Every structure is written in structure tokens, then in C-alpha cells.
Amino acid sequence: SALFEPYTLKDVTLRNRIAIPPMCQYMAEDGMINDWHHVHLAGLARGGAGLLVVEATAVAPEGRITPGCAGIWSDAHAQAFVPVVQAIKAAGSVPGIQIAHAGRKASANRPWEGDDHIAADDTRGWETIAPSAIAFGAHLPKVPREMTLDDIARVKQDFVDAARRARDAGFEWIELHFAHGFLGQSFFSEHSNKRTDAYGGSFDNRSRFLLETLAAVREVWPENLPLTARFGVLEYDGRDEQTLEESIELARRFKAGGLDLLSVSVGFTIPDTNIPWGPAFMGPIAERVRREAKLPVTSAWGFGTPQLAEAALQANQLDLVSVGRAHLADPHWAYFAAKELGVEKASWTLPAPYAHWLE
Amino acid sequence: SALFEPYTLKDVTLRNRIAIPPMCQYMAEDGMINDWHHVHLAGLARGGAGLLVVEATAVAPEGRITPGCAGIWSDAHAQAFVPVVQAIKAAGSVPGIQIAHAGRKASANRPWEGDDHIAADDTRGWETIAPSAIAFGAHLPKVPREMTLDDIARVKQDFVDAARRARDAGFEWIELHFAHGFLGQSFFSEHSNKRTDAYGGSFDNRSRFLLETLAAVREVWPENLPLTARFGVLEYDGRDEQTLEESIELARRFKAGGLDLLSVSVGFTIPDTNIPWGPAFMGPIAERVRREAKLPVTSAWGFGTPQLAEAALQANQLDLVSVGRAHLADPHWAYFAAKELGVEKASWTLPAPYAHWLE
Numbered sequence: 001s002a003l004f005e006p007y008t009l010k011d012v013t014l015r016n017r018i019a020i021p022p023m024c025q026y027m028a029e030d031g032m033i034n035d036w037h038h039v040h041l042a043g044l045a046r047g048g049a050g051l052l053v054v055e056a057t058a059v060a061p062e063g064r065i066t067p068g069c070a071g072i073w074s075d076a077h078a079q080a081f082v083p084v085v086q087a088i089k090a091a092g093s094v095p096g097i098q099i100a101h102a103g104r105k106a107s108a109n110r111p112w113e114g115d116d117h118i119a120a121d122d123t124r125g126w127e128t129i130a131p132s133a134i135a136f137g138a139h140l141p142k143v144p145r146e147m148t149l150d151d152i153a154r155v156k157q158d159f160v161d162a163a164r165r166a167r168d169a170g171f172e173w174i175e176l177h178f179a180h181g182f183l184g185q186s187f188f189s190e191h192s193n194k195r196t197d198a199y200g201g202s203f204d205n206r207s208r209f210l211l212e213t214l215a216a217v218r219e220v221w222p223e224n225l226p227l228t229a230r231f232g233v234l235e236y237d238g239r240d241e242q243t244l245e246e247s248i249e250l251a252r253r254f255k256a257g258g259l260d261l262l263s264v265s266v267g268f269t270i271p272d273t274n275i276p277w278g279p280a281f282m283g284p285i286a287e288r289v290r291r292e293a294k295l296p297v298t299s300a301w302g303f304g305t306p307q308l309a310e311a312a313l314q315a316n317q318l319d320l321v322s323v324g325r326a327h328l329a330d331p332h333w334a335y336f337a338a339k340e341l342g343v344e345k346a347s348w349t350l351p352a353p354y355a356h357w358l359e
Numbered sequence: 360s361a362l363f364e365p366y367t368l369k370d371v372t373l374r375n376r377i378a379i380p381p382m383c384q385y386m387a388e389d390g391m392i393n394d395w396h397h398v399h400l401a402g403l404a405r406g407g408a409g410l411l412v413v414e415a416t417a418v419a420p421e422g423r424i425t426p427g428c429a430g431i432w433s434d435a436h437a438q439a440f441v442p443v444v445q446a447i448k449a450a451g452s453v454p455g456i457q458i459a460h461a462g463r464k465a466s467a468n469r470p471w472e473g474d475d476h477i478a479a480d481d482t483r484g485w486e487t488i489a490p491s492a493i494a495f496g497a498h499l500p501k502v503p504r505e506m507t508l509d510d511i512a513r514v515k516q517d518f519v520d521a522a523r524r525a526r527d528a529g530f531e532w533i534e535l536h537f538a539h540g541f542l543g544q545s546f547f548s549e550h551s552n553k554r555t556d557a558y559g560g561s562f563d564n565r566s567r568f569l570l571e572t573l574a575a576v577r578e579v580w581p582e583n584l585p586l587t588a589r590f591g592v593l594e595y596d597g598r599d600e601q602t603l604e605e606s607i608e609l610a611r612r613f614k615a616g617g618l619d620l621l622s623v624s625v626g627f628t629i630p631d632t633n634i635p636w637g638p639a640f641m642g643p644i645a646e647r648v649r650r651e652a653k654l655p656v657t658s659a660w661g662f663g664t665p666q667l668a669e670a671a672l673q674a675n676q677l678d679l680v681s682v683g684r685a686h687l688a689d690p691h692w693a694y695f696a697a698k699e700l701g702v703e704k705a706s707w708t709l710p711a712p713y714a715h716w717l718e
């Protein structure tokens with residue numbers, strides 16, 4: 001099975017091609033993770049996936065999506081990850097982390113508590129920042145504060161500090177969150193970036209925050225550990241071919257700047273779009289990015305059907321298959337997939353205290 | 360759905376009729392549990408089952424099955440359970456524990472490391488104890504030491520101390536392991552008990568260890584928390600009707616002595632038997648015990664098919680359905696069962712960070 005072939009990137013070897021993508025849990029308190037996360041993540045690692053990427057973890061308090069988001073903006077925040085990293089490694093999975101800044105989509109309620117911008121008089125909320133003072137709209141109506149050049153310098157340094165902390169906590173894989181309409185994506189998109197300084201206007205200027213942040217992170221992140229990013233390569237906003245062309249050009253510049261793998265997604269920069277949701281719908285666009293930027297990729301959405309994951313790999317659409325919600329449903333999805341695909345000794349996807357009894 | 364109806368026993372209410380029976384993990388060190396158990400048990404509790412019974416936990420070092428078995432023979436052993444109990448409660452499941460003594464089946468290898476009695480010159484092994492100096496046979500050839508009256512007194516006190524420790528660690532449900540050919544079962548069975556003192560020969564004498572142990576435990580175990588036992592009610596040894604009759608009589612004496620629920624099993628006292636394994640095969644015998652002893656019951660073996668669990672409950676064969684291996688395969692089996700049986704808002708079997716996304 002292609003799904004169960006190992007994968008080596010830099011000095012890291014994944015035991016199979018199943019990646020668990022970042023999935024916010026909304027269970028942290030002032031950014032500090034707790035036994036929710038410990039058990040959730042260790043349980044997933046034991047389920048057999050080769051790579052487990054921790055949820056969007058804010059590089060600064062105002063870069064959380066919600067009051068429940070994880071953070072890594074101090075050394076105490078980082079040290080809370082150490083036992084979890086160690087548990088993921090004990091289970092034979094590779095521990096990764098997505099470091100993030102929610103930009104104009106920050107200061108929102110948890111998804112089961114309204115999913116919308118927090119009311120102005122709610123003591124939990126905060127002012128959001130963005131390249132330009134323009135609201136997302138819809139359920140996120142707050143107008144963010146336009147960043148100063150000093151704010152840009154500060155946020156880049158927060159990404160550096162976050163990467164340094166992730167390294168020192170023992171993570172073996174890092175993902176910069178430049179997707180999903182959050183701060184990085186919003187610098188790239190002309191919808192959200194109306195700046196007329198070095199950080200907006202032209203393709204080079206819109207790319208600048210993302211490229212500078214990547215380069216700054218690269219200074220502290222070990223060359224022997226995968227350096228990755230998530231990036232929305234189109235919006236489904238009626239501008240798709242031009243946007244895809246620019247996104248692929250940026251992917252080439254990421255590769256030249258030391259990016260080892262790109263997690264290919266959708267922008268979600270603005271609400272007025274027409275996204276053609278369907279099983280593995282991103283496969284062909286991931287394949288195009290992979291081919292035209294000559295860079296390994298992953299993608300997500302609907303790959304919880306094992307045969308579809310297998311097909312995407314065999315078609316060389318993807319190098320790793322990211323499987324999210326199916327792992328919330330069943331932490332042992334990798335074992336289910338091994339059985340489905342007829343892998344020999346499928347139960348030994350799991351550790352011995354489970355595997356022995358399920359043969 | 361009957362499977363998703365709550366159940367109240369004494370002061371304890373289970374949110375549904377799904378019980379996770381004790382399942383040895385073989386991951387403890389000198390009886391001390393660790394993060395294997397913490398994550399395993401907390402993950403299961405979050406999966407939605409109403410009751411989670413911790414694996415056979417030895418009341419004395421020589422009563423472990425294997426070198427990997429959990430123990431509760433000192434206060435330090437008991438205190439290791441406290442964070443796990445607290446995690447199970449945080450997830451809304453009821454924490455239980457099975458306290459045990461392996462008798463002549465002790466000093467064995469882990470099941471994936473031979474499953475047989477440990478060699479005499481292996482430094483991990485120990486002398487086993489039993490009512491009579493008679494080996495099980497087959498892969499368990501060691502002849503146990505015949506217990507003295509002082510040994511009987513000591514082991515009863517070890518059960519008391521174990522129950523006291525379980526209580527003080529916060530467990531809300533206790534199960535005495537009088538099944539599966541271990542010490543208690545072996546006192547009851549004429550195959551293994553050839554004593555001619557007060558603890559063998561007659562039905563009353565063979566029952567005595569079990570009844571005295573129950574009564575002694577009852578002195579320290581709170582009256583408002585379920586007091587239960589697991590007991591093998593037949594052997595499939597060609598003596599089934601007579602053995603069933605005696606076992607039901609013992610069940611009546613357990614009930615009279617304060618037992619709240621009986622987990623009905625097979626004896627596994629000797630190897631030369633013909634057990635008719637099949638899905639829910641114990642249902643009719645559990646039903647007979649339930650009816651003739653007028654005592655709530657659970658049973659196990661093959662109830663991981665949700666419709667079969669439901670049928671057993673609707674037929675009043677069982678009060679709780681024990682589902683073991685299916686939970687090793689999928690910690691979230693209760694969610695799977697809720698979907699299968701068409702329960703409304705099935706995803707809310709799970710906590711919010713999962714349930715919201717799986718609706």
C-alpha cells in the first residue's frame with residue numbers, strides 16, 4: 001500500500017504517509033495546554049499515524065483565534081508541550097506543530113459558542129491586527145487595526161521565538177500557518193491587503209511578510225528538521241487562475257527559501273466565495289502545485305476514505321495524506337485504513353497491548 | 360435506544376449501558392501504572408462509555424498475572440491511580456477497578472511474550488499460591504504452593520486493603536475478580552480445590568473464601584458505591600448443569616451479602632474444556648443467573664456489534680453490556696454505536712471538541 005510506505009524528509013522518517021493535520025481543540029486557558037491536549041494527542045499518536053501536527057498555536061496572545069486557543073508566546077507556554085511531545089515520540093509518531101497568528105479573524109468565540117467575533121464588552125475579547133483596516137464581514141465584522149512597520153517586525157520576531165521554542169520543546173516538524181484567511185494569508189491577498197508601503201501592492205510586496213517570516217524562522221529552525229507551511233493557493237472567488245499562478249510562484253520562492261513541504265489549502269480570506277466541497281476535491285490543485293513548484297505537498301478534506309487516500313498517493317497528487325475529522329471520530333483511523341487496504345499484520349499499526357488482541 | 364438509557368446503582372448513575380470491562384495492558388512496572396494507562400483510560404472515558412473498569416489490579420505482588428500487571432498493594436500504588444480517576448471523572452464516565460489475585464495462573468509471561476509460565480531461572484518470576492498444589496497444565500505447568508490458613512487470612516486482608524485504597528483513590532465502582540481460573544475461582548471449583556479444611560470439600564467450604572472476602576471488603580467499601588464481582592458460572596467441562604446450579608446458589612449468597620451486580624463469565628479453571636465461542640454466547644446464561652438469583656448482571660464476548668448489545672438489553676438478558684476488544688480497536692466505539700442505533704445527536708456521545716465537527 002502506498003499509504004503505508006514510510007517517508008523521509010530531511011532527517012525525519014515518518015512510518016507511513018498518514019498525517020494528522022492541525023486541529024484546534026479550543027481547550028487551552030490563556031494559551032496554556034492541559035490534560036485535554038495531552039490525552040488527545042498521545043492517543044492519536046498511538047493510533048498509528050506517521051505524523052501528528054499540533055493545532056494552530058498562537059505566536060502572540062492577540063493571534064489566538066479564540067480564548068481557548070493554544071499559545072507558545074512564552075517559555076512557560078512552550079514547556080507545557082514537552083510532556084506531550086515526549087508522549088508522541090514514545091508512540092512512534094513524529095511530533096509537529098503549526099505556529100499561527102489569526103490576524104483579523106482573531107478574538108472569536110469557540111465554534112460551539114457562536115463562532116463569531118466576541119462582543120465589544122465581553123471581557124475575554126481583544127483588538128485584532130491585520131495588514132489593512134478592513135473587516136472579513138459576515139460573522140467576523142470587527143475591523144482590525146492596520147499594522148505599523150514596528151508591528152510587522154514584532155510579529156515576525158514572535159514567529160521566530162515560537163519556532164525557537166518549538167525546537168527546544170522537541171518538535172521535529174514545524175508548519176507556518178499562512179492559510180485560512182489568518183494573518184499571513186491576509187498579507188498575500190489583494191482582498192485584505194490594501195497597503196501602499198513595502199508590504200502591499202505588488203506581488204513582491206504582498207509576498208514580503210510571508211517570505212521574511214519564513215527566512216527569519218529558518219535562522220532558528222534546524223536545517224535537519226522539516227520546515228513547512230500551510231498556504232491557501234486559491235479562493236474560489238472568480239479569480240482562480242490568476243490567483244493560482246501567483247500562489248505557485250510564491251511556492252517556488254518558498255522552496256528556494258528552504259521550505260521542505262507545502263500543505264496546500266484554500267484561502268478563506270473573504271466570505272463571498274463558492275468552494276466546491278467534495279471528497280478529495282483539492283487533489284488536482286495540490287498536484288498542480290507539486291508539479292509546477294517541484295515541491296512535496298500534502299492536502300486535506302475528505303481523505304478519511306482509505307481508498308481515496310491511497311489513490312491520491314498512487315497518482316502522485318500528494319506526498320502525505322492529511323486526515324482530520326476521521327481521527328476525531330476514531331483515534332485509531334490508521335488501523336482502520338490498514339485493514340481496509342489489506343495491509344499485512346494490520347493490527348500492528350497499533351501498539352502491542354492493542355495489536356495482539358486484534359489480529 | 361436501550362443501550363443509551365442511563366443506569367443507577369446505589370448512588371452512582373451511568374450515562375448509558377455501555378461498560379468497558381477490565382482489560383489488562385501489561386504495561387505496569389512493579390505494579391505501578393504510568394502514562395500508558397493514563398492516556399489509555401482517559402481516552403476511553405472520553406469515548407462515551409458510561410462505566411470504565413480498570414484492568415485486573417493485583418492485591419499482592421504474587422497475585423499479578425505477569426510482570427506487567429498493575430498493582431494496588433501499597434499506598435504508593437494506589438496514589439498512582441488518583442490522576443487517572445480524576446481524568447475519567449472529568450470525561451463524565453464512572454471510574455471502576457477490578458481487584459484481583461491470579462492464584463495458580465500467576466507468574467506468567469505477557470501474552471505477546473509467550474503467554475506461558477515464566478521459566479524457573481528467569482529473575483522476573485515468582486512462586487504461585489493456590490488452594491491446592493495442583494497445576495493448571497498446558498502452558499501453565501507450574502505447581503502452586505498450597506495456602507496455609509494464615510495465607511488465606513493474609514490474602515483476604517490484602518483484598519480489604521486494596522478496596523480501601525481504591526475507595527480513597529476515588530473509584531466509584533469496585534469489582535472483585537472471582538473469575539477466569541484465578542485465586543477466587545480456584546477456591547470455588549472442585550477441579551482446583553482439594554482441601555479438607557474449612558475451605559474445601561463441601562459447597563459451603565468451597566464458597567467460604569469468596570464469601571469471607573466479599574464480607575471483609577464490604578466493611579471498608581462504601582454502601583453507596585456499587586460493590587460487584589466477576590465470577591465464572593460454568594466451565595464447559597461436561598458438568599455444566601450441576602456447576603450452574605451451584606454458581607447460581609453462590610450468586611444468591613453474594614446478593615444477600617451486599618453484592619450489587621454480578622459480571623457473569625466462564626470459569627477457565629482448567630484447560631480441558633469445550634467453550635462454544637460465538638457472538639453474545641453468554642447472553643442466555645447471564646439471563647438465567649439474573650432471573651434465578653434476582654441480581655443485576657453484565658456479560659461480555661462479542662457485544663461490539665451495536666444491534667446485538669441493544670437486543671441483549673431489550674431482552675433483559677443483561678443490565679449493562681460489556682464491550683472490550685471493540686474499544687481497543689476504536690476508543691470511540693460508543694459514538695459508533697450511537698450512530699448505528701440511530702440515536703439523536705449521536706456525535707454528542709463525545710465531548711464538544713469532537714462532537715461539534717461530527718454532527
Ligand SMILES: Cc1cc2nc3c(=O)[nH]c(=O)nc-3n(C[C@H](O)[C@H](O)[C@H](O)COP(=O)(O)O)c2cc1C
Pocket residue numbers: 021022023024025054055056098177179180230300301302303304322323324325326712716
Ligand atoms: C476541529 C478542527 C480544527 C481545525 N483547526 C485547524 C488548525 O488548527 N489549523 C489548520 O490549518 N486547519 C485546521 N482545521 C482544518 C483541518 O486541518 C483539515 O484541513 C480539515 O478538517 C479537512 O480535513 P478532513 O476532511 O480530513 O477533516 C481544523 C479542522 C477541524 C475539523
Ligand SMILES: Cc1cc2nc3c(=O)[nH]c(=O)nc-3n(C[C@H](O)[C@H](O)[C@H](O)COP(=O)(O)O)c2cc1C
Pocket residue numbers: 353357380381382383384413414415457536538539589659660661662663681682683684685
Ligand atoms: C486485552 C485484554 C485484557 C483482558 N484483561 C481482563 C482483566 O483484567 N480482567 C477480566 O476479568 N477480563 C479481562 N479480559 C476479558 C474482557 O474483560 C472481556 O470479557 C473479553 O475481552 C470479551 O469481551 P469482548 O468480546 O468485547 O472483547 C481481557 C480481555 C482482553 C482482550
Ligand SMILES: O=c1ccc2ccccc2o1
Pocket residue numbers: 024056179180
Ligand atoms: O485554520 C483553521 C483553524 C481552525 C479551524 C476550525 C475548523 C475548520 C477549519 C479551521 O482552520
Ligand SMILES: O=c1ccc2ccccc2o1
Pocket residue numbers: 383415538539
Ligand atoms: O481475567 C483476565 C485477565 C487477562 C485476560 C487477557 C485476555 C483474555 C482474558 C483475560 O482475562
